[PDB]
Symmetry: D2
Amino acid sequence: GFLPHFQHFATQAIHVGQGNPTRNCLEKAVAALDGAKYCLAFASGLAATVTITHLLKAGDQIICMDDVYGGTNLYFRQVASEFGLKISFVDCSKIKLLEAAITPETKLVWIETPTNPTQKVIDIEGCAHIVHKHGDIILVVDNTFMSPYFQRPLALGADISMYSATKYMNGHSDVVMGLVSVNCESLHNRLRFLQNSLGAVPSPIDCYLCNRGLKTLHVRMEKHFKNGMAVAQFLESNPWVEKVIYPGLPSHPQHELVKRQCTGCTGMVTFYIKGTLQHAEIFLKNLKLFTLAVSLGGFESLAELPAIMTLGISDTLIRLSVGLEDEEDLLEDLDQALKAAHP
Amino acid sequence: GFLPHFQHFATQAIHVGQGNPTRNCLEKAVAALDGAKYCLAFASGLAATVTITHLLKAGDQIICMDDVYGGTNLYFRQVASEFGLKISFVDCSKIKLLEAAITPETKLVWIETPTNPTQKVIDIEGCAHIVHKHGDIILVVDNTFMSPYFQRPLALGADISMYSATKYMNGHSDVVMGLVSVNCESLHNRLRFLQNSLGAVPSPIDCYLCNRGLKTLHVRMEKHFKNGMAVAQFLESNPWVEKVIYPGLPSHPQHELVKRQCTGCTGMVTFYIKGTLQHAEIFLKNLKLFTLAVSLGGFESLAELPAIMTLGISDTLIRLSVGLEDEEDLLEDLDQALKAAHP
Amino acid sequence: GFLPHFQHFATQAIHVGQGNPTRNCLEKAVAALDGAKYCLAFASGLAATVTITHLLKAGDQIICMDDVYGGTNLYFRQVASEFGLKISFVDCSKIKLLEAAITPETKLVWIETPTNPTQKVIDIEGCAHIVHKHGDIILVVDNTFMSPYFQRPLALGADISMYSATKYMNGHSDVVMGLVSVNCESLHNRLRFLQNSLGAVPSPIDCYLCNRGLKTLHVRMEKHFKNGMAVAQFLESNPWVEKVIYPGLPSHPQHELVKRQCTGCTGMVTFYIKGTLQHAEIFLKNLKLFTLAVSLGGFESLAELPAIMTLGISDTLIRLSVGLEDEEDLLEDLDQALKAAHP
Amino acid sequence: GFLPHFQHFATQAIHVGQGNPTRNCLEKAVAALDGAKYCLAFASGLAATVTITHLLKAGDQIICMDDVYGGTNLYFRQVASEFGLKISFVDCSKIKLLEAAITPETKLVWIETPTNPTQKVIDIEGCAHIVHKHGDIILVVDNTFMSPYFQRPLALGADISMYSATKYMNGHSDVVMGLVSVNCESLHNRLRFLQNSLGAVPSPIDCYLCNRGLKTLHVRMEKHFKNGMAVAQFLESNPWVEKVIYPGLPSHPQHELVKRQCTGCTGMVTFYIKGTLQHAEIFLKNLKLFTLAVSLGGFESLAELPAIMTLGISDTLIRLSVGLEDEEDLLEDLDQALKAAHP
């Protein structure tokens, strides 16, 4: 059994909110969903990330969750380099390694769960209890790969929960957002000053369309979960799949952590096709419903071979972003394409 | 057990469609959801209704489902009067009355299910075989009060399935539509000619935003059903409620028909408060989450006393349009307000 | 000297307006611009036309301005045929012919000025004094080819001024409208009843975006006029142009009427290239700035050979819709392409 | 005589442009209008300003045009303080003071023309040769108070031309932008890196709606100029006005520079009412067409008493943002209100 879904969530998304009034209402809304007293809207998740780092001073160290196969490590390096900050990347799925890597100059720790695309799950409050045991170190959790609907990092010990809205989310509505939620009273003040004085803020239209999208997040994510679960279960029992990686499955090496840390899972399913690279690539060309794309989220089910679209990652590793179509149609498409790769 | 949900529905809404290209894609999409070969988009449900009547000639008779407590009878009278047509209103929930009322001048039969607000359920395929047993008579079903997701009138024997989109629907997006689906190819041709020659058509923006809304109709209506079900069940077992009218409940006099005719029910719940008019009106002003409105649909739960907001209808009859908030929050609001009316 | 521009026009468009509140504000706004007490918004110009005809009774006759090379004659025939109306087409640029064609059954007269694409100008109040001398006959002027900014048919004697907004107007904003303005107190009432009872009405979004576009109509049309004038003048003095048709030029056979009937002209310029069909078609392929299109209006300058894109019309007749680009750039493109057709 | 309007401007805005395709097209378009090889879009003018400062290193000095009565000096102080930069404010309308204030640590010079609200005009090319005479110093001109249509700072010697789009601009369309144009290719490269690595960028929706607004900028600004000119001339010859400040008037102390530096002026007119503060405030409440607001731009004419709405500024100084209404209507409103303040 997972964590029970957060109370008043859907009610809050729909009713909460109903200077910059549109942004103010959005921040008021999101803060509720994040189980927070405060929230700040920025022009993008990246801009949100930069602002958070501006809380630090030259010489201070950041420790980041090591994103091996994603590209995000670069972006953090460029920011740290730009503002004279020390940075280090650690596999925080191994809680020892994090604790071992902390210095007295460590002031910020950044965490993504689950990781993309191999989906390792990081114990948030495990990390939080390690981070807060000595010194004052801000713990930030990138809450993008789950939603506020499935994961609440603030109620888990993190000091900051950042959610990045991309142009692909909510049926490809071209909304881009960096949403920073915090329960600390000093943190909100400093961030708020940074927000208004640096101007990295969304437009009123962005704020409106983002707020609008939130109102259907729960029913959307549920279907993502429902379909994802189905797709994962099907793939795992399929004779042409080596193995499957999906946090909602008991087969997942961190499944027990997931159930106590989250209320559900997204439509992001990773699996390993049997055979070599060229079965994986035949498979991809036989999909008639799944669309080939590197993006994440959306109403349409997406498929990706990260080994070719971006030591190297597995050529048999495939990452699906399961959409909102009929479960059967998805299963049938996968079944057909898998069969096409193994005559 | 209800009818199994229509296959490929969610897939179709999301993928089908992806002169007037935007309208063409919308009509192509909706036709799939309506289980139809053809669909036509008009500027409004009313304009769609007028167009359908233009299939007839002066002297031809229409027989309409008698909408007692709704206002719609007027609109049909005005149309019939305008174009020299005879019209008569019959309680078609009693199939007896319909067959008795058929004339050789009868050319069109109009049907709404369920009715508003007392929610009578009309046997569509019962009516369809009665209508098609002699003469050439078009049967039209107003499929607005259910969705194409819950009810498919074309697969039930009707010749025409009209869906009227209002601006309150899909989170109050200001989209207005008349959508006419038909499986007959002579019918489609005449309607298509009428459509392009009379100009009562939506704008490209309307078509786009309508098409966009369709892609989440299934997950939205499901939540409406889930919450509606919860609300209905709660009310019925509540000591301050005389009785409850909800097609999804076994207590409903047409429940068996519903399960055979539909795949589910909407968030429209009608019940009778105990006591007189003034408990009903105390109840309404103690609601803190439900919003007082005469409109139907939306993300927000609505409450209405039709006896005051429009032989007279019951002073104790209340009609709720249950939204997408958290089931618990709704139940508590209703529970609180009911007790507030009965010290 | 033309008629002085209508007073308070720009002020009205911007400030006037700042049931169906958005439509109500739009109708209030447009009525001011049309110099009217009343205005009604329909889903399209065609729907507006149909509604106007519904003022008539079976057997009543319509007399329409004969649109030879446009297609619109068909649409009127289909409507008249649909509702048992008698119809006749007369060259109303010859005022005698109109007066000669009036019957006691004549109840409606329809007029477009200027015509498309040969741009004959009809004397509105000449027609109005002929129409109103006996019987009660509604005179309607299709005020689409001019704007309310350049032409005010109600202040000229017409009983009804209809303006049709197409998806191409106001920088291709997908707004479609039928706007009917009237000063008569019986006419407005009947039309208003027809409007609300037949449902051929625009959406709130349509109404908003239409209202928004109006606020810049004056500065837009001015540039259309300014550029059009330049283009016309250039073409007429160009050695590869047989002759030019533009109401703003003294060379135009109805120029004197135009100046007393209008406050300016649009960007619609018609001219005859020297030589045969194949110089005209070479010319078209050498345009690098002008875009080949059959549509009318928009920010981009458009070119059309109606003889090929739709007794026959001239193969050397070309109709330009001059946009809002720099006058020189337009002139240079035309000069270059003309020179390319005559080595 | 002013500078001749920039060639191909209107053509470019309309046609140029027709990764992040929407932003790329916008930047491609704006660069043309700015007479630039390159342009970069940021989430806001303020974010654009911060990015530009990030070209500098701790210890480097900025010299800013001293914005006395505006608030902008604060924002620069906060930025400089945040990133360890020295800053100084100099009246650069007096070229004397600027040259005297240049240090070897001086790396950036910031300039606004005209100033708000007293409208000092700064000699851009005067400042540019002073700045570029020794050392490597970036000159930036805030080109917001004029448009790219009236002022081209890059063609005048500046290295960077920044245009800040506010949500009041283009008929209050909620678009917010920072647009940075540069002709240096080293400058563009560093800025481009900063742009993509810091994430302070607009959304696709922002870029689209901004790009859309550009297409009518020329015809809009012209009307602003035309009306502004009229308003200024009227006020100056009005017996209840002490004096008037408008760059388009020969009475303006920098008028000759203006004509050499610009192709026209905006709708921003500053004047001094006769009498004391209380005539100025009576005047404001008697305006029936002008709207009281502190914002700048829009379709509607605005009035502001900066002495009360924000050594102190004049109690009799009033700043108007003249809109797009009819010149006469504006003149009558001003005439009426002025007489209302002087019985």
